[PDB]
Amino acid sequence: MAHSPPGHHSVTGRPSVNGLALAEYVIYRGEQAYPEYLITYQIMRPE
Amino acid sequence: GTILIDLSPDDKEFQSVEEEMQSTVREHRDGGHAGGIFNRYNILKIQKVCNKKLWERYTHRRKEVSEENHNHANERMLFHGSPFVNAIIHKGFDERHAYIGGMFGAGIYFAENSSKSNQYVYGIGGGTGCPVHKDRSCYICHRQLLFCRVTLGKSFLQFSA
Ligand SMILES: O=c1cc(-c2ccccc2)oc2ccc(Cl)cc12
Ligand SMILES: [Zn+2]
Secondary structure, three states, X not given: OOOOOOOOOEEEEXXXXXXXXXXXXXXXXXXXXXXXXXXXXXEOOOO | OOEEEEOOOXXXXXXXXHHHHHHOOOOOOOOOOOOOXXXXXXXXXXXXXXXXXXXXHHHHHHHHHHHOOOOOOOEEEEEEOOOOHHHHHHHOXXXXXXXXXXXXXXXXXXXXXXXXXXXXXXXXXXXXXXXXXXXXXXXXXXXXXXXXXXXXXXXXXXXXX
């Protein structure tokens, strides 16, 4: 596992082409996330 | 020490979590190759994950980050999709859940789009799809995502395609 950039605690990946995409994020310490909810689902076939 | 508590579909907390799941679906540039073709989900269950030790581990680190960033943890709720959800909920996130080859280096990746995390439920690029039918677009097999509390603190901004 890599390190955060110096002076930072995470990385934000900002979308720069796909105008509809939301952001992605990276942390480098497992202690910086807590899995609050487990969601069980199926994807639905469009009609 | 982990226990899972089911939420009633009548519970406001069930409803706000489902809405964040459904409303952050988007179309992907792979036309559905990795994650399947869909505009929405059928939510089968939402469980609250309770583990005292893992939570205190999180809040300890959260306070360290906050005191390094003018008392601002910059906490978000974000999706995470992985073949290892059952190890995560019992033992916490660690180096074995990192995406070694990701665009931003070896770390633990989280998404605002639930449909982005869905591309990783069955592995990188969707792996070989569901274990039963080998179908990355299976409409039958049950999938799991985590909705996670994440401390970003001071985040390095990377512009990207
Ligand atoms: O939710 C994700 C899980 C994973 C993931 C990666 C390797 C192993 C397990 C899960 O990859 C992602 C990459 C980018 C974004 Cl934005 C989200 C994810
Ligand atoms: Zn299947």
